[PDB]
Symmetry: D2
């Protein structure tokens, strides 16, 4: 919880501002340093609020639809990963970014990637 709540950045310089509720909610804003995007976008997601005790990381995920007041890229990214607490805390994720497409173009609708988030404060 307090481990996850805070501000994180990935290797691209994007900014991930998240609040982890005691229920398992993730709420916050995302600012991508790249792509058809500017300023902050609403995010929401979920996380395992009772993780395993064997030293495993905490599973989690969240979504951003790339519409705000400034731009709309008609697409959405989901990040799926785990929080790994400790000396060098991090959120290791893989993501899927789907753009709305016509049916003829559906085969190329989805980008796949990976972001590593590390935390300040």
């Amino acid at each position: 919880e307090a481990g996850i709540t805070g501000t994180w950045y990935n290797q691209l310089g994007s900014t991930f501002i998240v609040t982890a509720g005691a229920d398992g909610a993730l709420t916050g804003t995302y600012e991508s340093a790249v792509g058809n995007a500017e300023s902050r976008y609403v995010l929401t997601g979920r996380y395992d609020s009772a993780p395993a005790t064997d030293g495993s990381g905490t599973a989690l995920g969240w979504t951003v639809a790339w519409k705000n007041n400034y731009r709309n890229a008609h697409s959405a990214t989901t990040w799926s990963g785990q929080y790994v607490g400790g000396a060098e805390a991090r959120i290791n994720t893989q993501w899927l970014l789907t753009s709305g497409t016509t049916e003829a173009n559906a085969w190329k609708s989805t980008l796949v990637g990976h972001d590593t988030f590390t935390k300040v404060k």
Copy 2:
């Protein structure tokens, strides 16, 4: 529209409400895996989609913990809603399990689900 009760090819049940400002909320019930009864989901969708006939982009997350079970895992679906006579939500998903560092290389499954308003 998006709000409704959807089923995928596995027989899983996706009950979702689309807010006017882009929020998705509801419950997910998986017919397979370490899962039982309903799980909370949240997500986002493009509340002002293109008019060129493109689908509506969206995504949502389920953390696989409820009062019945906890698989220490989370799935995210990324895809698009495609309107028409037979509405469909086409998705690909990433399912990540909490692992020790030794096992992180095998933390994540990938797959694809297609959702329809047709019951198993």
Copy 3:
């Protein structure tokens, strides 16, 4: 082995002509019905030449680099999946399509998708 070798088609109408060697090699050509592609492209791959007997599918994979005499899309696709035998023979796959990019565009280098192949028939 005698199952995999053949001409397959996927849901896009692409043509996968493959030969499975006794040793585990896959060789042949791929013709995509969509994208920056025309005519046949060389593929190479591997498959499990001693599969389990519990009813599990046969694991396999292959690569096409999208360069031939006709075009060069500066891209490569890998299909990873399994062959499921029978009269209802199919190869179920997911794929990763990576394009060569500059460092600035690396985050968006890779598409992900899924193809299902069946025969003719």
Copy 4:
């Protein structure tokens, strides 16, 4: 450029010859999982890449059967070679295991490896 011995962040060993007309041939040794010693690999790469500073697209496959073990699985790596002072091969990979029809939804692992001339 590509021809040589590479290592990823797991300590796995990627020995590859890149042919002039686009073949990749070599052996792979994974430092993790149900595997031991070297496995045959084969793949393809763009033998006439763009000159705009873009990387060189490539891919290869390993079937996890050798003389020592058989994991009834196959991994494909998809990525690009980036030449230069910090030369590397950046990939994402898909690992499918043979499954029964009922377990097909969980047949495929997804991940990412970065290969350098350095080992960890």
